[PDB]
């Protein structure tokens, strides 16, 4: 079996995910009325909405070797001389020196030339271009996303536009909100697509809108807004959760959200809303479900179940329950009192209160300690390697990067492993004494599809841009995952290729049975008589921390 | 040179609270402490407790219940409280600085406890 | 909500904490009569004594551009100049080539300044100074810490001082450790201090000791030593602990403690001190605790406690337990033999005693094996980040860094949000090309105070000196934490302030309704033109394993 390949793009900056910090978990219990129970957190349901918006803009510069900026394109050539002709007006019009200034296509002349698709791009991100003074004409195709309120949408390269994605004309959209002139915004009835690739042009209309911002043109497709959602989603359903009541405000704590939530100590009435057939519904739903999954057999219900707003915008539902044994103790000491309702008896009895108020503290430290241990180590290898450690908290691929204290997150293009090809040597000719780290890859994003030159990455990663370069070795010998298998690369030249089942693999925490043997070091004569280095693998923590440090000296010698 | 001069009620019905104040100069308080000494009629001598420069405080093992001690630094007076007097407390109490060990003593206060 | 600001200094290594390593695991189970039981550790009370010292120095130099040390101050400068009148005397003696000199602040003539406070200190670590050949006085007070010996006494800068803090003259001290001659000592009666910032003299006396080391003048206030408290304490008591025989020394091992235990199999007599009432009391109050917490619906007692000396100086309690099924055992086969007393009976059936054998023996390897999973990711997380790993070792913020394999630790000054300030701009205009890779920063220790220059960290985290600067990129973008939201800067330019829950959160360790888009890279004109690098975010961990592979290509080419 191959794996299939992932052209990672670097994000942008339009999906920002912070991530959790430790807590300061209390040395002793100290909560009040300490009781276990089935829980559904639910989060506000931001309702995202993504659809494709184009983007225009030109650029231009001055041949002699200076002032080179972006600027827009006006309606009309859009609409005219793109949409109806695919092509592009020669001159351009900019502000230089806070003067109004026009320059042309290599002085020529006003003339119109057409467009041409995007040299490498991607299958799902088509861009073209009238080239790859001097002026250049440039539409792309780029995603975009809204959330609830509507008032502004980011585009996939990061920059918002603040501006109603529903704002219009047609059916009276004029109330949606707007922060551009209204000579800034165009829309268009009957409008007919051309897709610049094939120019075949659109089969029905479809009304367009237009917007020009100060450094591009923004346009999209006007959809009426779809009918409003639940105004809340399910988050995760929490098989136990334990509630404490301190300082005049409730304490909800897990084993899995690694969070703790704190209310009012008021039930929010949930009935005041008629929207409760969706969330009283099915939250109602889950907790019978995770009742008689597990605790139907040693567990009883207290009582009808509870809805609490919780900081940060969650809405806790709860369902109190307590163990068998601990009901015993209850309907025993009733028993006495009385010379099988478990509501309004609850919390009564101090004395029977006061040990499982210390046995439940202890299980709810123990969590807050473990996930403490757990998030510092995670939020380390995040910073260590994000592409790893988003992909697996997502389920998928994913590119990231840390913008400052913040992650950054897009979306990889996976292409298959026989559209890939390896270069037999990682050695450049233009400079003797540097060569590739890594093997160098050419490919396809798809089947007949024009080649790209790129690099290999790690995990099967490709990366379009050739500078992962070092000072040479002897005695080299690298072995770097490529599809399914392994290819071995020996010398800075391509050796052979060998599967996944070649190699001794250690699933397993702890193997004992390793072959191994004393390897005895052999190093070329031409590392003593030149003095050249010789290899050493991929640099430990300390050779990166050592191998800076004779930086520094070499600085202070020169 | 140093002293200490204590300052109480002298007589206190039993089952009340007690409060004695020892004036004390010669040294900062926000250094050394003062501690406490009792002694009953015909009996030896019995450590109460002390207070250190800090807010740090010991108090006897039979009398940590309801033995307090606490101060003001700007005032140089230790105030001693004792709630739940039996009829045993019956004693002269006085105040011992630690500019030393025990270098320097009060001259004590007798109180009697009854009805 | 908005968190505290905090400014770590740098720690001397006054407070050094070794930190555990790895075991080398059974690969089977060799242990002889295994056991469970409750267990109470107790560690060798070191009796901590900490307290104030003020230090005195001075500084000497020489104009030309040389000959730049420190020397201390005597005694009569101290009593009478700086105590009596703040002010430091002029001239300063000193040794230089092995023979006495004499200097003077600009040459003028002998003459007395006073003493200024310093321009940022901290406010818990005053300092004074004559000035912000040249001859400068210093005055500082720094905490002071000493152990139960109380032969040495580590101040604030890591510098150890070789004498008892109780030595004196006043209540016949004489007998106390002190390695100084007698006349670098000197202790004065009715002392009178003196706060520099204020000038208001004290109010009653205190006993203050002066010693003069070859580097400076330390004096403190001598108090008497307090009464010794109890020899040992307790260290953590032990949920659940199992105790094996092996090679004629007993084998303690937890789950909580990650560290084993050895005894030799004989019960240190602790009633041969009369230390039980407070070990013995304490202990045995645990016993019960634990016993009836979790142990007295499913164990039974086996005899009295027992305690052991274990190596490394801890004291452990011991209490073993058995389960009722392993009861059932004994009696059962007890009344066999007969054709209730547990003690003198365990360990003797050993067809009953082979299988508990290996049932807890793959218990304590389990655990054995699992701490060394754990031990070596938290060390190499240690070596990552000391801040945070100290941090949450102990609860509270705190600073540390690595002298060398020991690892340095100290307290951090907390600030209030209200009383920093960020500067609008991260830009250097001294310099094109370079900028600070993180926002400036100003702000005051307390309220109406002096305003101080620094640079935000990480985690609110303070910095004093402003050295992190970076070449600068296009299509900058930037999130740094800011209290308790975040502060967004765009091309090196403050942009706005958001808050922590504008922000999507992944508390959970896997979310899957994350609702990213594909990124498209927009770069500037100018990379193309200008040949200019782009962003790139923080360096990934290749990336800084590739970013210094390049240098050595430059330090080549040089
Ligand atoms: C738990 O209860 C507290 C206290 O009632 C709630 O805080 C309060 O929230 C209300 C809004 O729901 C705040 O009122 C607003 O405050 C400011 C003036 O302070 C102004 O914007 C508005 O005119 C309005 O009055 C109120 O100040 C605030 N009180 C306090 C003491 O902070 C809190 O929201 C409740 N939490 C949950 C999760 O239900
Ligand atoms: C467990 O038992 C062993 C063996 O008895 C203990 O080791 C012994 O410890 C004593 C001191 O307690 C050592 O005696 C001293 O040794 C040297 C000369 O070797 C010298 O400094 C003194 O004159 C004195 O005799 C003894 O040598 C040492 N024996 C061995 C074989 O190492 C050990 O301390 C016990 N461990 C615990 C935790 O109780
Ligand atoms: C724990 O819960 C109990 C039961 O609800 C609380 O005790 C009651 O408190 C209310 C006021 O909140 C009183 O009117 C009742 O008389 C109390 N007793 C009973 C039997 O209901 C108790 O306050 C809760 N503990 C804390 C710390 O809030
Ligand atoms: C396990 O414990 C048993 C019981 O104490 C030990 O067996 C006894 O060993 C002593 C000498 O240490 C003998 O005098 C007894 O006759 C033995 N039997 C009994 C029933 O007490 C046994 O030695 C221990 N195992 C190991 C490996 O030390
Ligand atoms: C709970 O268990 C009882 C006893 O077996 C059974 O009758 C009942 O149907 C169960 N309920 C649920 C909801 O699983
Ligand atoms: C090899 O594996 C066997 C089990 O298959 C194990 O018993 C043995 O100890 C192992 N040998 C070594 C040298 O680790
Ligand atoms: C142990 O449990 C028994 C049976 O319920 C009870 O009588 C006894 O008081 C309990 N002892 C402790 C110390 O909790
Ligand atoms: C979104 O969350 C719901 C639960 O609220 C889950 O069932 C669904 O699979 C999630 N969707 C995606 C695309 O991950």
């Known amino acids: 079996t191959d794996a299939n390949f992932y052209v990672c793009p670097p994000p942008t900056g339009a999906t920002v995910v912070q991530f959790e910090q430790p807590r300061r978990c209390p040395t002793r219990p100290e909560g009040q009325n300490y009781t276990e129970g089935i829980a559904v957190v639910f989060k506000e349901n931001i309702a995202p909405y993504k659809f494709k918006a184009t983007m225009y803009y030109k650029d231009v510069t001055v041949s002699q070797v200076i002032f080179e900026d972006r600027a827009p394109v006006p309606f009309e050539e859009v609409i005219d001389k793109i949409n109806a002709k695919g092509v592009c007006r020669s001159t351009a019009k900019y502000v230089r020196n806070n003067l109004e200034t026009t320059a042309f296509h290599r002085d020529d002349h006003e003339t119109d030339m057409e467009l041409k698709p995007a040299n490498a791009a991607t299958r799902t991100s088509r861009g073209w271009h009238t080239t790859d003074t001097t002026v250049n004409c440039i539409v792309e195709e780029v995603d975009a996303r809204s959330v609830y309120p509507y008032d502004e949408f980011v585009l996939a390269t990061g920059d918002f536009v603040y501006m109603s994605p529903f704002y219009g004309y047609r059916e009276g959209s004029h109330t949606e909100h707007t922060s551009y002139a209204a000579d800034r915004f165009k829309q268009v009835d009957g409008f007919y697509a051309r897709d610049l690739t094939t120019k075949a042009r659109a089969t029905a209309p479809t009304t367009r809108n237009l917007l020009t911002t100060p450094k591009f043109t923004v346009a999209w497709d006007w959809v009426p807004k779809r009918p409003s959602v639940c105004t809340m989603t399910k988050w995760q359903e929490v098989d136990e959760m334990l509630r404490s009541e301190y300082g005049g405000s409730f304490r909800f704590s897990s084993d899995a959200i690694s969070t703790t939530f704190t209310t009012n100590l008021t039930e929010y009435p949930l009935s005041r809303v008629d929207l409760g057939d969706c969330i009283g519904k099915d939250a109602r739903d889950a907790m019978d479900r995770i009742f008689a999954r597990r605790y139907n057999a040693t567990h009883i219900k207290v009582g009808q179940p509870q809805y609490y707003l919780a900081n940060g915008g969650f809405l806790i539902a709860y369902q109190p329950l307590l163990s068998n044994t601990l009901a015993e103790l209850y309907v025993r000491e009733h028993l006495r009192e009385q010379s099988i309702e478990f509501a309004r008896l609850q919390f009564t009895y101090n004395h029977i209160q006061r040990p499982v108020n210390d046995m439940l503290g202890r299980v709810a430290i123990a969590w807050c300690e473990e996930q403490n241990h757990e998030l510092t180590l995670w939020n380390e290898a995040r910073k260590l390697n994000p592409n790893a450690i988003a992909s697996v908290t997502v389920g998928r691929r994913v590119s990231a990067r840390m913008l400052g204290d913040v992650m950054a997150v897009s979306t990889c293009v996976p292409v298959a492993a026989d559209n890939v090809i390896v270069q037999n040597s990682m050695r450049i000719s233009s400079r003797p004494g540097a060569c590739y780290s890594r093997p160098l890859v050419s490919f396809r994003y798809e089947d007949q599809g024009p080649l790209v030159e790129g690099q290999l990455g790690e995990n099967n990663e490709l990366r379009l841009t050739r500078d992962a370069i070092e000072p040479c070795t002897v005695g080299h010998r690298r072995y770097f995952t490529f599809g399914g298998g392994y290819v071995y690369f020996e010398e800075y030249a391509y050796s052979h290729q060998l599967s996944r089942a070649d190699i001794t693999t250690v699933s397993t925490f702890i193997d004992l049975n390793i072959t191994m043997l004393e390897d005895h070091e052999f190093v070329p004569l031409e590392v003593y008589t030149r003095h050249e280095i010789k290899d050493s693998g991929l640099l430990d923590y300390t050779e990166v921390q050592r191998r800076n440090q004779l930086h520094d000296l070499r600085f202070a010698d020169i | 040179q140093v002293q200490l001069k204590e300052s109480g009620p002298g007589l206190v019905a039993p089952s009340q609270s007690l409060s004695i104040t020892c004036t004390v100069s010669g040294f900062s308080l926000t250094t050394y402490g003062v501690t406490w000494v009792r002694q009953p009629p015909g009996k030896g001598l019995e450590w109460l407790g002390v207070?250190?420069?800090?807010?740090?405080?010991n108090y006897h093992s039979d009398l940590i219940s309801r033995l307090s001690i606490t101060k003001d630094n700007s005032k140089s007076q230790v105030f001693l409280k004792l709630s739940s007097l039996q009829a045993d407390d019956t004693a002269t109490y006085y105040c011992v600085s630690y500019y030393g060990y025990f270098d320097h003593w009060g001259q004590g206060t007798t109180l009697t406890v009854s009805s | 909500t908005d968190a505290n600001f905090y400014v770590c200094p740098p720690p001397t290594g006054a407070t050094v904490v070794q930190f555990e390593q790895p075991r080398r695991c059974p690969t089977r189970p060799e242990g002889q009569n295994y056991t469970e039981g409750i267990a109470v550790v107790f560690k060798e009370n070191i009796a901590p004594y900490k307290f104030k010292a003020t230090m005195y120095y001075k500084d000497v130099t020489v104009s030309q551009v040389i000959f730049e040390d420190r020397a201390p101050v005597p005694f009569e400068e101290v009593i009478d100049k700086i105590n009596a009148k703040g002010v430091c005397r002029s001239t300063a003696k000193y040794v230089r080539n092995n023979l006495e000199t004499t200097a003077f602040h600009r040459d003028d003539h002998e003459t007395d300044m006073e003493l200024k406070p310093a321009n940022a200190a901290t406010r818990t670590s005053r300092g004074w100074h004559t000035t912000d050949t040249t001859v400068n006085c210093i005055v500082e007070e720094v905490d002071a810490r000493s152990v139960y010996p109380y032969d040495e006494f580590v101040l604030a800068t890591g510098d150890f001082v070789y004498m008892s803090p109780f030595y004196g003259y006043r209540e016949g001290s004489h007998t106390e450790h002190t390695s100084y001659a007698a006349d670098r000592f000197k202790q004065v009666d009715g002392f009178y201090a003196r706060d520099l910032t204020t000038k208001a003299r004290a109010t009653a006396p205190t006993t203050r000791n002066l010693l003069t080391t070859p580097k400076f003048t330390v004096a403190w206030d001598w108090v008497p030593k307090r009464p010794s408290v109890c020899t040992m304490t307790k260290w953590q008591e032990v949920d659940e602990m199992l105790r094996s025989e092996y090679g004629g020394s007993f084998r303690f091992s937890s789950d909580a403690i990650s560290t084993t235990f050895t005894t030799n199999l004989t019960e240190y007599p602790l009633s041969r001190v009369d230390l039980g009432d407070c070990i013995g009391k304490d202990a045995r109050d645990a016993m019960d605790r634990i016993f009836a917490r979790r142990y007295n619906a499913t164990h039974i007692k086996v005899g009295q406690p027992q305690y052991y000396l274990a190596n490394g100086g801890f004291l452990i309690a011991y209490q073993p337990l058995l389960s009722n099924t392993l009861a059932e055992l004994y009696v059962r086969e007890h009344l066999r033999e007969q054709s209730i007393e547990f003690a003198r009976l365990q360990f003797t059936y050993n067809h009953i005693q082979r299988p508990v054998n290996d049932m807890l023996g793959r218990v304590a390897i389990a655990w054995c094996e699992e701490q060394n999973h754990e031990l070596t990711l938290w060390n190499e997380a240690r070596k990552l980040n000391p801040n945070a790993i100290a941090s949450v070792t102990v609860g509270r913020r705190v600073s540390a860094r690595m002298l060398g394999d020991v690892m340095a630790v100290s307290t951090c000054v907390p600030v209030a949000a209200d009383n920093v300030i960020v500067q609008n701009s991260m830009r250097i205009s001294s310099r094109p090309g370079a900028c600070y890779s993180r926002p400036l920063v100003s702000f005051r220790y307390e309220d109406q105070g002096p305003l101080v220059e620094g640079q935000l960290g990480e985690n609110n985290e303070l910095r004093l000196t402003r050295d992190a600067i970076e070449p600068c990129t296009v299509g900058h973008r930037r999130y740094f934490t800011f209290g308790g939201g975040y502060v967004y800067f765009e091309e090196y330019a403050y942009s706005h302030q958001l808050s922590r829950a504008d922000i999507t959160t992944v508390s959970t360790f896997i979310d899957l309704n994350i609702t990213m888009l594909e990124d498209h890279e927009f770069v500037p004109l100018e990379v193309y033109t200008r040949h200019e690098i782009k962003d790139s975010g923080l360096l990934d961990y290749t990336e800084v394993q590739r970013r210094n592979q390049l240098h050595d290509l430059r330090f080549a080419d040089i």
């Open positions: 207070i250190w420069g800090d807010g740090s405080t």
